[PDB]
Design a protein around this nucleic acid. Structure first.
Lengths: 180, 186, 66, 155, 97, 223, 125
RNA sequence: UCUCAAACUCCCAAUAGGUAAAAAGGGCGAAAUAACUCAAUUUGUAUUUCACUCAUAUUAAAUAAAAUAACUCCAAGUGGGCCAUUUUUGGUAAGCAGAACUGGCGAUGAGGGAUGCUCCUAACGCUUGGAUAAGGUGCCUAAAUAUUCGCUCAUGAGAUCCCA
RNA sequence: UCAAUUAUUUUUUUUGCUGAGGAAUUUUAAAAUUAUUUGAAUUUUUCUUCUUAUAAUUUAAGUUGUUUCUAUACAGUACUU
């Protein structure tokens, strides 16, 4: 529906297996959940992991399932812990981060934004190894601990912007910053 | 931009139309073109194309050669898209039915004497527009002396093309590369 | 006086302009170099077959005329 | 620079390991026909009748057989044209070719199939058709016996 | 004249691009079944909002038992995911020292 | 004369009735196929065993890139493929050699599984056909079945729905129909791209290569 | 730009006057095709004097037609009336450069008998 | 046991290369011919004449604006080239000299790259309209002082490949 | 409240641009649609389907109609160039 705050990164549960052979009379079936912008991207990342772990390329296997995975309670805000492997210019690093968000997909988008903004790391150079809902008391980030207080009621303190129609070129008098 | 082999064009070759300003032949090809387009058969179309062709593709056909072919086709009408020439190696005729582009007068007289039949192509068109029970003939293509000089380079191995020789002289063009004794041989 | 030496450049591309031409693949081939004795016996066999065909053709034609 | 007969053959005309010395008589006994295809593959022991560098591993028709020689028509690319060239090789260097042997086996099975199909009065399609079509398929693995995978972390 | 074929006919002049989807006569020309297909669409359309409103409850009520089962099936798929995360997490803590 | 003309007209009407009957069998088959996929997925969910459906048999390949500076093997495959123009789309029979050929030209093409609505829509809105003698063809919009019922009468297709049916799912008569139709010259997408020179596969926003089902939305965008 | 009149469409009014003709005084304004290298004409740099092109050529129904709606036929003798009567509905008379006034007047009278206007009728009066 | 080699090699790629996918032919049979052939006139060879019969009535794997294919003739211009990616040799290096594969320019307009023979997009009759590409959207200068999350204050900050 | 996202579909509000052609037998034939007529069908019908017979028409089978104006001019400062 939305296109004003929207994230098109979604989560897909993907299942595949090795093709039956004389050597592989009974295959091994493999499942994983993967965050991607589309089904082809999800599949290609799944295939890359099948290649990295197993000996199975797209040629050597067959896809059992790919399906988008559904938010249980979208109105509820939840504490996500996310564990990364990422590449810098001069090396590879592991990192564990906390985000309070409605859903895991919002968190992954936030994570890519954070890694890009603060570390210059592109989506290609990041690998999420597990994102999951965790207890509020177990968060290490002060900015999320501050939200988790009993009484939250800060003053808003931001600029007006309106929209294109009432985005006047010139004005008779000077604007009111406080807004009250 | 569309990628195109030979820029999308069919650029086939050969004669567009008769280049001669000769009225009778221009008239004749109009007739045979008309017959060729309307008629179902290949025969008329082949005749029309062959009528259009260059002089070197208008060779003479030998009367003896025509006679030799027609003895297996004994009551049938030969058509020849070239000229028919007479033969002074030939003892006598066996009586023939011939349509040709041009007749030498001695041959024509011999055919008449033999009790044979001299057909023009217009007369053939009238009598046999279908070409049913008719026989298409043509003379030798590669008989001509220019073609006797064509093919693989003189003095190059296995070659047998005639050279464009300087003159008839005994001393000339039999040495270097044409006899083993002098330099080498082909 | 100080020349450039070589390049293979464009020659392959030129070859592909008319394509790389290939054998005409004839069913018969001139046989000058092929196995003496065995080939002259083949020439005798072939001449023999031609003679056999000629004998058959001449007799049959003469029989048909009668 | 120089361009003699065996120019640039140090690696190419080396023996393979454990294959040194003269090879079995029963290689030579192998039967050849005119119009066979034949590969030109050279053991390095026997030096007479050794073909040029380009013809190693090439295949072509036998057009002539002699006492211990075999004439083979091989194609060679000469700049802008491929032409057939008469490579004389030895019994030592001829190997009976195998593409023809697949055709022969294919023909034999097809002929038996043709006999059966004609006997049963039902058409068949000989064609070595496509690879890619897959039917629908089932996985009967227990739902907790399936393998759960995740990405690999760093050193 | 007996030999000569009767006169044939050339192709017609260029005609404009009468639309396959929106020009009905042409659409029927291309697809003679389309009128029935148009009828099928019209039949669904003919059924008005009151009958649809009565119907909607029955459809949903008859789906529920299946929907609860389908939820359980997906919940089990999730159980496997959760179990894999827990086992892997434990394994790392075991592994590290 | 008139009796022969009348008889032919009656035969022509009969053929259109026959095509309607084929169309009806096709219409039943389309719904049956749709329902069967649904049933297969629902059966798979119920049971302890898991299941997948079959291969989809065709693939629609759309070209994206200009004809300047093309690699030579890529020029050859394009020539065989018939994606001569930059917005050519064409149907391809899924095979391994066809897939390998497709892989070689991949950075210059998007491709995917087209869906029935798109197949129908594309042939209807942008279907042109090769009318003339063998290699003396000419590009005509279809507009009537009798023309294409002539050439594909020998191979017993005779009707545009039958053409839609074969194009949608590769059957006994695919190669000829596919070849016989002129290659689809498409418009630009009426809302463009993220970035032309990048893959659909990339984490970076892009468009070339396999677009699977979602090829349809692009085809609708560029119709 | 383009000049429609009825179903007579003429593409280009402006004559393709020759490359930089005022720049070198010796040059004349009628077209001459550069065999020059880097000429800024054949090397097809935009913003110079345009090359003529066959594409600008007239439609086959019009081909040589006038806004008069009749093809012009130039007339230097009275005798030219005899084909022009049969073609009057498609062709118009123009009287030639030379024509002496007595003869010219007679031709003008004849043209009126043929019911076809002379496009240069006021001339030599 | 440590570290190794253009001109070392147990093993050993990708890329590039060759042969193959049937009708002027191939099967299994008979009869013929030899001065070839063996002990041996069917003992083979090869050839020839007669047979019986192999898919192609969707084509013995695909795909193909596959004849725009062949082939012959006659002739021109040219023989100083250059640039780019990737592999690359010499040389301290070089917008240096020398190679390889392919694509460009040369012989080429057009749109972008602020400008620019070569980079990118893309190859061009004349016109009308559309929608896009490369690329943009503070103003010069056409479209957002758009949305959205980070990071960033510099007493010479930084800001689109080639590119300074 | 009955989302959303796919699938097959069915419409609709304003509106931009275009009008080649010229049918002495392909502007023909069928289709479509309307008013008739006969037999069936089935999701069952005030745009339900087929085919049986009859007419007209256009969605078939590449713009036509109406009203202005130039102008009630004779070359004008308008119009052509």
């Amino acid at each position: 529906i939305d296109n004003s705050l929207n994230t098109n990164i979604h989560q897909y549960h993907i299942v595949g297996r090795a093709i039956p052979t004389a050597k592989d009379k009974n295959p091994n079936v493999y499942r994983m959940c993967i965050f991607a912008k589309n089904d082809t991207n999800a599949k290609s990342r799944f295939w890359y992991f099948m290649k990295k772990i197993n000996k199975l390329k797209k040629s050597n296997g067959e896809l059992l399932a790919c399906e988008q995975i559904k938010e249980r309670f979208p109105l509820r805000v939840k504490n996500y812990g996310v564990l990364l492997r990422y590449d810098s210019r001069t090396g590879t690093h592991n990192m564990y981060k906390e985000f309070r968000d409605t859903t895991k997909e919002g968190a992954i988008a936030q994570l890519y934004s954070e890694m890009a903004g603060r570390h210059r790391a592109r989506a290609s150079s990041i690998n999420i190894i597990r994102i999951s809902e965790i207890s509020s008391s177990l968060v290490r980030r002060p900015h999320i601990k501050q939200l988790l207080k009993r009484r939250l009621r800060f003053p808003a303190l931001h600029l007006p912007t309106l929209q294109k129609e009432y985005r006047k070129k010139f004005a008779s008098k000077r604007p009111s910053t406080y807004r009250m | 931009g569309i990628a195109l082999k030979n820029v999308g064009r069919i650029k086939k070759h050969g004669r567009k139309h008769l280049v001669s300003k000769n009225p009778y032949l221009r008239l004749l090809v109009k007739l045979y073109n008309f017959l060729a387009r309307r008629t179902n058969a290949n025969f008329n179309k082949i005749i029309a194309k062959r009528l259009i062709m260059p002089k070197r593709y208008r060779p003479p056909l030998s009367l003896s050669k025509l006679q030799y072919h027609m003895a297996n086709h004994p009551n049938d009408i030969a058509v020849v898209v070239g000229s028919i020439t007479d033969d002074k190696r030939l003892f006598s005729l066996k009586q023939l039915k011939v349509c040709a582009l041009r007749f030498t007068e001695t041959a024509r007289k011999r055919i008449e004497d033999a009790g044979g039949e001299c057909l023009t192509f217009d007369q053939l068109a009238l009598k046999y527009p279908t070409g049913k029970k008719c026989v298409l003939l043509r003379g030798p293509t590669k008989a001509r002396t220019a073609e006797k000089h064509f093919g693989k380079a003189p003095g190059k191995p296995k070659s047998k093309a005639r050279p464009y020789v300087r003159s008839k002289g005994r001393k000339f063009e039999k040495a270097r590369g044409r006899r083993k004794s002098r330099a080498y041989k082909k | 006086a100080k020349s450039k030496n070589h390049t293979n450049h464009n020659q392959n591309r030129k070859a592909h302009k008319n394509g790389i031409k290939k054998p005409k693949k004839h069913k018969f081939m001139s046989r000058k170099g092929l196995d003496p004795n065995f080939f002259r016996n083949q020439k005798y066999c072939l001449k023999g077959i031609q003679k056999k065909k000629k004998e058959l053709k001449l007799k049959a034609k003469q029989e048909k005329n009668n | 620079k120089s361009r003699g007969k065996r120019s640039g053959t140090r690696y190419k005309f080396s023996k393979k390991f454990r294959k040194h010395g003269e090879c079995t008589a029963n290689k030579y006994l192998e039967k050849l026909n005119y119009g066979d295809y034949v590969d030109i593959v050279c053991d390095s022991t026997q030096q007479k009748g050794m073909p040029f560098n380009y013809y190693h591993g090439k295949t072509g028709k036998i057009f002539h057989i002699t006492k211990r020689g075999v004439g083979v028509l091989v194609n060679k690319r000469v700049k802008h044209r491929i032409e057939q060239k008469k490579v004389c090789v030895r019994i030592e260097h001829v190997r009976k070719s195998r593409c023809n042997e697949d055709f022969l086996l294919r023909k034999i099975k097809n002929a038996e199939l043709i006999k059966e199909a004609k006997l049963k009065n039902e058409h068949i399609n000989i064609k070595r058709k496509t690879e890619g079509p897959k039917p629908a398929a089932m996985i009967k693995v227990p739902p907790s016996k399936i393998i759960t995978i995740e990405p690999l972390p760093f050193y | 004249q007996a030999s000569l074929l009767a006169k044939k006919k050339p192709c017609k002049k260029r005609l404009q691009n009468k639309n396959s989807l929106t020009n009905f006569a042409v659409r029927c020309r291309l697809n003679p079944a389309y009128k029935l297909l148009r009828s099928l669409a019209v039949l669904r359309m003919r059924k008005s909002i009151l009958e649809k409103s009565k119907n909607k409850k029955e459809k949903r009520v008859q789906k529920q038992i299946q929907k609860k089962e389908l939820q359980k099936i997906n919940h089990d798929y999730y159980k496997g995911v959760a179990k894999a995360v827990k086992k892997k997490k434990k394994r790392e803590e075991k592994k590290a020292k | 004369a008139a009796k022969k003309i009348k008889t032919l007209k009656l035969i022509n009407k009969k053929k259109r009735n026959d095509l309607r009957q084929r169309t009806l069998r096709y219409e039943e088959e389309y719904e049956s196929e749709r329902k069967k996929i649904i049933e297969l997925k629902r059966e798979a969910r119920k049971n302890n065993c898991f299941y997948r459906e079959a291969e989809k048999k065709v693939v629609f390949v759309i070209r994206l890139k200009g004809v300047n500076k093309l690699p030579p093997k890529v020029r050859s495959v394009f020539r065989l493929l018939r994606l001569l123009q930059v917005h050519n789309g064409v149907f391809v029979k899924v095979n391994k050699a066809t897939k390998e050929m497709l892989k070689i030209v991949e950075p210059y093409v998007t491709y995917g599984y087209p869906t029935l609505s798109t197949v129908r829509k594309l042939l209807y809105k942008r279907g042109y056909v090769r009318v003339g003698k063998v290699r003396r063809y000419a590009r005509k919009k279809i507009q009537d079945n009798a023309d294409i019922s002539k050439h594909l009468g020998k191979y017993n297709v005779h009707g545009i729905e039958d053409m839609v049916y074969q194009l949608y799912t590769c059957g006994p008569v695919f190669k000829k129909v596919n070849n016989f139709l002129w290659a689809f010259k498409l418009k630009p997408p009426r809302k463009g791209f993220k970035a032309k020179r990048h893959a659909f596969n990339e984490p970076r926003p892009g468009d070339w290569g396999n677009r699977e089902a979602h090829i349809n939305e692009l085809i609708n965008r560029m119709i | 730009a383009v000049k429609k009149v009825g179903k007579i469409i003429k593409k280009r009014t402006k004559k393709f006057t020759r490359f930089q003709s005022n720049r070198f005084m010796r040059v004349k304004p009628a077209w001459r095709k550069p065999r020059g290298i880097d000429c800024r004409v054949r090397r097809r740099y935009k913003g110079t004097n345009l090359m003529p092109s066959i594409g600008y050529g007239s439609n086959k129904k019009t081909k040589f037609l006038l806004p008069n709606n009749k093809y012009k036929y130039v007339v230097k003798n009275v005798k030219e009336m005899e084909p022009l009567i049969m073609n009057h509905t498609k062709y118009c008379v123009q009287i030639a450069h030379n024509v002496s006034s007595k003869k010219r007047k007679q031709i003008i009278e004849r043209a009126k008998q043929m019911n076809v206007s002379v496009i240069n009728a006021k001339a030599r009066l």
